[PDB]
A paper describes a structure:
Contrary to most organisms in which three enzymes compose the 2-oxoglutarate dehydrogenase complex (ODH), actinobacteria rely on a two-in-one protein (OdhA) in which both the oxidative decarboxylation and succinyl transferase steps are carried out by the same polypeptide. Here we describe high-resolution cryo-EM and crystallographic snapshots of representative enzymes from Mycobacterium smegmatis and Corynebacterium glutamicum, showing that OdhA is an 800-kDa homohexamer that assembles into a three-blade propeller shape. The obligate trimeric and dimeric states of the acyltransferase and dehydrogenase domains, respectively, are critical for maintaining the overall assembly, where both domains interact via subtle readjustments of their interfaces. Schematic illustration of the reaction steps involved in the oxidative decarboxylation of 2-oxoglutarate with generation of succinyl-CoA and NADH/H+ (ODH reaction), with emphasis on the catalytic steps catalyzed by OdhA. These include the ThDP-dependent decarboxylation of the 2-oxoglutarate substrate followed the reductive acylation of the lipoyl group provided by E2p (both catalyzed by the OdhA E1o domain), and the transfer of the succinyl moiety to the CoASH acceptor (catalyzed by the OdhA E2o domain).
The same grid preparation strategy was then applied to other full-length OdhA samples, i.e. enzyme without added ligands, or preincubated with either CoASH or succinyl-CoA, leading to maps at comparable resolutions of 2.1-2.2 Å. In all cases, the maps, which showed well-defined density for most side chains, allowed to trace the OdhA polypeptide chain unambiguously starting from residue Pro102, corresponding to the N-terminal boundary of the E2o domain, with excellent stereochemical parameters. In contrast, the full N-terminal OdhA segment, corresponding to the first hundred residues that include a predicted helical hairpin analogous to the one observed in the crystal structure of MsKGD, could not be traced due to the lack of supporting density, confirming its high mobility in solution. The E1o active site at the dimer interface showed a clear density for ThDP-Mg2+ in all cases. In contrast to the crystallographic structure of OdhAΔ97 which fits the resting state, all our models refined on single particle EM maps adopt an activated conformational state of the E1o domain, even in the absence of added ligands. The presence of a bound acetyl-CoA activator, most likely acquired following heterologous overexpression of the enzyme in E. coli, may therefore explain the observed OdhA activated conformation through a mechanism that involves the stabilization of the loop 809-836 in its extended form, promoting, in turn, the activated conformation.
Residue numbers in the entry:
A (entry chain B), B (entry chain A): 349 to 1220
């Protein structure tokens, strides 16, 4: 059992052509670059049958024209090993000790010279010898891991737990990293992980009490929100503290909630870290909250969310100082082996796309694992980049504890069954080298078992409760009754002037200058448009002292060239952000931050959801280029935004701004899918709205920000109505009207006793119906608008209908096809809530498999047909 | 304007320590590895202000301790340039000519030695000098590209076209690749691409007639399906032929349809290629259909679907022999620059994760572009791997033709406005070197303009039609009236015996052997379960002579250990596929292929959709591990499966198998989201079903395969009912019952005149209600099952209800919450279709924000409450 190729027999060759010193330097370069291909990193003696084996002929001395006859000759090596001269025997010895034992390293692809040199120097010095106290501490942690697993196996046989047996070195690796961070003087560590070994990490790394875990297994579950539905035990989070064992440091440790969908926690935990860093406010030399992210081998290579999230690492609004990644490589999926899972040689090969180092380590050598953890945390602090660790290990049982893995992998489980564990091997090694006594070794086991037995007995004394029905979360948070959302006239004029107070030699571009002038004049003369209404809301909130963040694709300028939140000078390329300047000059330390995202919907929306969880007092908004591209983030909408409160008691106030409207631009630029969002709503989980005037959009945003109802808000924003002059607002609507309106009654009814038809509408189709009513002179019609879709404002609709006592018909008019839009939701729910209302009649486009037509002339013909049908 | 650093002044150094020959070899290695960092590949003199600049100190002779005083000394170079000895002046000259001009190359990261050597030899030989005929052919193609763009600009000013101006070298690059493939003797080329330059590619590469394109712009659109909705002009496909200009070869060229969602065509076009290759059947040395895939720079770096699809390249059921990728790098998104779009240095850096070569080429040197196209197509044919081309160019106008790019990028558009085009520059170069006359150069322009003017005038003679309403696609395909789907008794016994005809020294695993015995005995005694029903269907179809493909996560064994389509011997690890063996021994050349996918839902489902489009006569099925993970493929469901026929006239017969059932395993293992699928249905777009017996599943699958209705099928499959003994089927149900049943009436009604309540149910909740009816002895109840959900079988439901003439109530009973499951769809539609039916009453779980509870005791309490409510 020796892992190297034997030395071969050959004749001595002459020193002609390429010199032999050149050949020895080429050998040094080969080991530094490709020596990981023959390193002892696998605990099993296993080669997977269907995977390609890379060529490694570069690592034998024959390929470089050297022979056994050169081993005692001396050569110039140019500073290798801190020496100018050396023998080929000593060169080979050093190379093999550094690059072919229990740690394999990839770092030669890095472009910067100082980075490469730092890693090279530390890997060739070697791992320093640990003290006896340190060695005993590693043994305590290994014991805890294995003992906990065995206890659960014995007391709860059938129950699913997802064990860590085979990979118990993870616990001392994570401990090493957290301890190193505490010594650097940092503030917090945030963890995200999957199912494999979660209950072990909660107890041994985070510090969740043992009583809690035992209760979970007996069927008593901790309640997150009053009347909540809940979730399985391996999807929950917790908080704790970690004290340094051989030091005076202390750090905080947190673990985040997640669903079963793998790798969906990656963008969410990055956002939590960024929000925490921003609150501490320590600058570029800060970055004092560390992200620690765990993966599995099949998931890391397969799912596309992983590289999509790593691509945000060095961008302006997303940087968090680097991420430490750990891949638990146990050489198996569920019933699938690596030959069917990836087309890369290693699972961690995405690192080479981003220019980052990789360390592969044997999971049956605990002292090497502790060294790699320390080295990774030091690299992050110095260079501010991502680092990847590959922990090679195995899975002792099946995928779960009810499965038989021999049916599909017979030969692999001949090697696994009946091995000795990593705790047993390490105890034998320490007693052999005389580093531990037998009394000590036996105490370590006895003490921990007594602790667990004690707690278990205490938990069984208390009787088990019986099942009870779950009520719901509708009334678990209060509504802001009697809150006023208007600003003063002085405040409005100051916001307007921000666009006139340009810096010293700044000028606007000629096509942007008219927009700025209109903003300064409109706050006294009238004609405020949609974009200016939105910015007035965010600006007012930043003045009071809040952090406002807006992110999305092309969101600084606007997709429809409407926003201009940051302006650029054509002559010098200088930038200007008016509303941020005004906020910083009022002495409440408010901020307005606008960022242009990368081209992603899954990672984008996930990052903003996380920001809202990490700072409860911030105002965060994500914008989509068109609302039709939000189906690329369906996982986040379904698993986090719509359902997080009911499952885990985790609350959010994220704002989604989704453009919507039927204007003839085709099926992928027409519908944000209102029907889908209204399906997900129940128990008052989120607010859904489609306003028709800038002032009403202003009041909606301010009500959300100043209330104490911590639930999301989904708004459907316009595209063509952005520049419609019938939709503009007057200053009195921002300063004298006090509240947001959920139903707007018709403002052009002469006599209410002559009305015989009521139309209900939502959005931009109002302005067409109104136009036609004026032209034809109809005094028997009244058009009523619905601005808030969920919850249903049934008291207001009832009040409006009651104001027309001679009405015989009610029509519901929409632009969307009959199987889309708000009609399906309203035809089900509204008749129950208003019993005395006449039967409703739909007027819409016909039902369709697609969203809209692709021909523009057909669009115009349909619109004419629709409006004609409404007016008899 | 010289691009190199000047030679510096220094003293001569002594030849001590590391020898100077060693230093010259290190310089050669540096240029081969990192010389692309200083190559002349950018047409503009532009450096983006916020992007990091890599260190390239390795490429100057000072860092290797050499000086101007060494330039005329001679050194040993070890075969470089086919010489044993050389001067430092000649070495530098050759390195700079090979690695620093108009082509930059990355290939040193490749692990195989023979690959590296092949590339190295071809890049150092250089580009061969082209003939005069070849040169004139390149000028014709450049002219065509630019001329077409200018014509459309002039005749249709406001209209959106997404121009290729700035990147006209794409047309000769694509032409070079297709021409090289025709010379190799291959069969077809399949293209997928986005919006940028689509109408140009349709006319100049594929061969779509010019009349068609002009008509599109005048508002006359070609119809795909009778009564279809349509789509915008830059989303359509076409077919054509390509004849070799200087050869006797011929090849077929195809372009595929796609939506606006970027990069969603990547898995779909890979599947089309695989299906075409399988039909030709030429073996491992075949692979004679070439995939050619075009991208943009922002999309390639940002979206996660790109690397997810490249990861399928070398897997067993997905390999297509390599893909040629072209990235059109025009240094801008919409209003976003590379500093805000990626954290990689180049957009094509994913190549280094997969071990593939990259070529960067200047888009203003057309002869170099034609060489790189040829070299890439040769590499694919020899090594069977992916290859990446980065075409560096610019965008002359805005994102569309209505946008002003100076508002956000002032300095970049000072360099662009008023340049001379690539056609103009090339004409000037050829007239300078005397390779073309002026008469020739003027004819090239005049002839092409005359051609276009002719066609345009002909198109305007015919009058323009007026708009007309679109009818729908419901009746555009026929239903299979009077088709019988039963097999003979002889056929059933033969299928059973397949599991007894093991190979010579094969034995089953002890936990798989009982399943095999039961399969052999059940075809004569009874008790056929769900999995065996499914396999009997697929086997029967493979016997008749069809290619059957089944793919999904853990689909060979089954997620619930139920299928066992391939078995493994514990002693030798040999594999056995019974139903494939039987099919190949009947002389119709049928196949049963089962594959275990990688861990992806977006790329998985997309690949199977593509397979169904590329071979209309195959039976393809995709399976999900649980139906709750299908929201990861929402883009494919919404943009291709649900809506492809109505938009493009593209038909498919894909089968989705989605597990579903409420059994207490929590919110991410309970619901496949039936309500979402029933929203997407209209105009008879697809079939949705939830059967309750194995025999009925058999008949459904066979009806779909033998009919002429080319639409998808979505089935909701069980989890616990897989092993329920009340649900098993008898042999007569496969051989004497002729058709699939859409409604199954109650089989335990003694007297029909005593019934006073009818319950409607779908799925596994039948077996609980039936149980309770027997126990309590209720003869006033009748339970009726609905097996097909869409379309609604309203004639059968009416017939069933009419059979109970004294009924007073109808109850609709489901397990799902009230805002989920089939109730929302049925409460809207069924009362209209059956006017005389009593008012329906819902019995279900309460409405919820999440899918299901996380506590198991609460699940059991809810189920009891539900069944009690049903029975008064
Ligand atoms: C979904 C969420 O975010 S929380 C909703 C929780 N409650 C429910 O779902 C209960 C069922 N729903 C209902 O009874 C009704 O739909 C109501 C009461 C919410 C609204 O019906 P109406 O009375 O017709 O609506 P109206 O617009 O007059 O609202 C009444 C008050 O509720 C407030 N309100 C209503 N919806 C919201 C909301 N989403 N956020 C904040 N305040 C709200 C209004 O500001 C108003 O306050 P006021 O006292 O200052 O006038
Ligand atoms: C959705 C698709 O893929 S095709 C939809 C095309 N048709 C429509 O949408 C019309 C509207 N729908 C209807 O009129 C009704 O729902 C029907 C006629 C389709 C079915 O209603 P019922 O008559 O109650 O159902 P029933 O099960 O008896 O079907 C009658 C016949 O249609 C056939 N059929 C019904 N649905 C399908 C289907 N999805 N695929 C194949 N055949 C079908 C049955 O096999 C049967 O044929 P038979 O005469 O040989 O026995
Ligand atoms: C998005 C998604 N797809 C599929 C699944 C189903 N699933 C659960 S575990 C698993 C295997 C995971 O393998 P690996 O990442 O190696 O984890 P290990 O069990 O080895 O820790 C799969 C496919 C899932 N939970 N989420
Ligand atoms: C999935 C998706 N997200 C967003 C968009 C909106 N969008 C259309 S074009 C575009 C810019 C694409 O940039 P690039 O890939 O460089 O294309 P180019 O315009 O340079 O050809 C964006 C974000 C889209 N069509 N699809
Ligand atoms: Mg694994
Ligand atoms: Mg671009």
């Amino acid at each position: 059992n020796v892992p190297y190729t034997p030395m071969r027999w050959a004749q001595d060759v002459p020193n002609t052509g390429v010199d032999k010193n050149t050949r020895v330097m080429q050998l040094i370069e080969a080991y530094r670059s490709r020596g990981h291909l023959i390193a002892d990193t696998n605990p099993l003696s296993w080669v997977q049958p269907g995977m390609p084996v890379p060529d490694h002929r570069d690592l034998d001395i024959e390929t470089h024209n050297l022979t056994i006859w050169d081993l005692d000759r001396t050569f110039n090596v140019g500073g290798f090993g801190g020496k100018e001269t050396m023998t080929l025997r000593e060169v080979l010895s050093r190379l093999r000790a550094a690059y072919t034992l229990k740690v394999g390293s990839e770092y030669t692809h890095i472009l910067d010279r100082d980075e490469r040199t730092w890693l090279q120097d530390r890997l060739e010095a070697g791992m320093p010898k640990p003290t006896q106290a340190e060695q005993k501490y590693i043994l305590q942690k290994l014991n805890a891991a294995e003992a906990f697993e065995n206890f659960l196996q014995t007391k709860y046989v059938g129950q699913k737990r997802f064990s860590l047996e085979g990979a118990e070195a993870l616990i001392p690796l994570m401990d090493s990293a957290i301890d190193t961070a505490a010594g650097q003087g940092l503030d917090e560590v945030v963890i995200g992980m999957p199912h494999r070994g979660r209950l072990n990490v909660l107890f041994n790394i985070v510090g969740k009490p043992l009583a809690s875990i035992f209760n979970e297994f007996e069927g008593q579950m901790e309640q997150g929100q009053i009347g909540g539905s809940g979730d399985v035990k391996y999807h929950l989070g917790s908080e704790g503290q970690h004290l340094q064992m051989f030091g005076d440091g202390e750090i905080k440790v947190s673990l985040t909630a997640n669903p079963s969908h793998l790798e969906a926690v990656n963008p969410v935990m990055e956002g939590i870290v960024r929000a925490k860093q921003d609150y501490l406010d320590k600058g570029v030399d800060g970055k004092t909250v560390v992200p620690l992210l765990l993966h599995g081998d099949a998931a890391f290579a397969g799912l596309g969310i992983v590289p999509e999230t790593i691509n945000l690492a060095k961008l302006r609004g997303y940087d968090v100082g680097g991420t430490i990644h750990i891949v638990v490589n146990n050489q198996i999926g569920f019933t699938t082996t690596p030959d069917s899972s990836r087309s890369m040689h290693y699972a961690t090969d995405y690192a080479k796309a981003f220019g980052c180092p990789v360390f592969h380590v044997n999971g049956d050598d605990p002292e090497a694992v502790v060294w790699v953890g320390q080295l990774a945390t030091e690299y992050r602090r110095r260079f501010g980049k991502d680092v990847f660790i590959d922990l090679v290990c195995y899975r002792l049982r099946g995928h779960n504890e009810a499965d038989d893995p021999s049916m599909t992998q017979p030969k692999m489980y001949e090697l696994i069954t009946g091995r000795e564990t990593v705790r047993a091997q390490y105890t034998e090694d320490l007693l052999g080298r005389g580093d531990l006594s037998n009394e000590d070794a036996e105490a370590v086991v006895r003490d921990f078992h007594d602790q667990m037995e004690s707690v278990f007995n205490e938990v069984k004394e208390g009787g088990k409760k019986q099942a009870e029905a779950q009520t719901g979360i509708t009334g678990s948070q209060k509504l802001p009754h009697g809150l006023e959302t208007n600003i003063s006239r002085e405040e409005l004029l100051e916001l307007g002037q921000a666009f006139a107070n340009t810096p010293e030699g700044f000028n606007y571009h000629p096509r942007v200058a008219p927009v700025a002038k209109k903003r300064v004049s409109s706050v006294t003369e009238g004609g405020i448009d949609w974009a200016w209404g939105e910015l007035l809301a965010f600006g007012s909130l930043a003045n009071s002292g809040r952090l406002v963040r807006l992110a999305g694709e092309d969101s600084r300028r606007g997709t429809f060239t409407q926003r201009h939140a940051v302006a650029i000078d054509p002559a010098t390329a200088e930038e200007f952000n008016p509303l941020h300047e005004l906020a910083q000059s009022k002495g409440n330390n408010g901020k307005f931050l606008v960022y242009n995202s990368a081209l992603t919907e899954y990672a984008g929306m996930g990052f903003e959801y996380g920001y809202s969880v990490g700072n409860e007092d911030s105002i965060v908004a994500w914008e989509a280029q068109f609302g039709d591209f939000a189906n690329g983030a369906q996982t986040i909408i379904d698993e986090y935004v719509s359902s997080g409160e009911a499952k885990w008691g985790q609350t959010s106030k994220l704002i989604l701004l989704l453009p919507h409207g039927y204007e003839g631009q085709g099926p992928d630029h027409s519908s944000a899918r209102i029907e889908r969002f209204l399906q997900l709503c129940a128990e008052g989980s989120m607010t859904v709205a489609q306003p028709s005037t800038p002032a009403n959009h202003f009041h909606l945003l301010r009500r959300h920000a100043l209330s104490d109802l911590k639930r999301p808000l989904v708004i459907f924003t316009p595209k063509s109505m952005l520049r419609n002059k019938a939709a503009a607002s007057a200053p009195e609507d921002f300063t004298e009207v006090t509240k947001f309106q959920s139903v707007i009654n018709d403002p052009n009814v002469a006599d209410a006793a002559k009305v015989k038809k009521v139309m209900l509408v939502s959005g931009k189709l109002y302005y067409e119906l109104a136009k036609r009513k004026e032209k034809d002179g109809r005094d028997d019609i009244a058009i009523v608008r619905i601005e808030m879709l969920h919850p249903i404002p049934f008291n207001r609709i009832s009040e409006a209908l009651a104001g027309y006592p001679n009405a015989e018909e009610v029509l519901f008019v929409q632009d969307e096809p009959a199987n889309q839009g708000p009609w399906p939701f309203y035809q089900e729910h509204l008749p129950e809530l208003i019993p005395n209302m006449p039967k409703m009649r739909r007027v819409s486009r016909r039902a369709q498999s697609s969203t809209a037509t692709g021909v523009a002339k057909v669009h115009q013909l349909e619109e004419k047909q629709l409006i004609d049908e409404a007016f008899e």
